[PDB]
Write a protein that binds this ligand. Structure first.
Ligand SMILES: [Ca+2]
Length: 37
C-alpha cells in the first residue's frame, strides 16, 4: 500500500478517510470496532 493509505491486518489498502465509517472495509473489521470508535 502507498505511504498515505492505511493497511488492514490482511494487507488491504483502505483510505484514511474510511475509519469509523460504518462499513466493514477491512476483512477483520478492526477499523470498525465499536469500542475503539
Ligand atoms: Ca471501513
Amino acid at each position: 500500500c502507498a505511504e498515505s493509505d492505511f493497511v488492514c491486518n490482511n494487507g488491504q489498502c483502505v483510505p484514511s478517510r474510511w475509519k469509523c465509517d460504518g462499513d466493514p472495509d477491512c476483512e477483520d473489521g478492526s477499523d470498525e470496532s465499536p469500542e475503539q470508535c
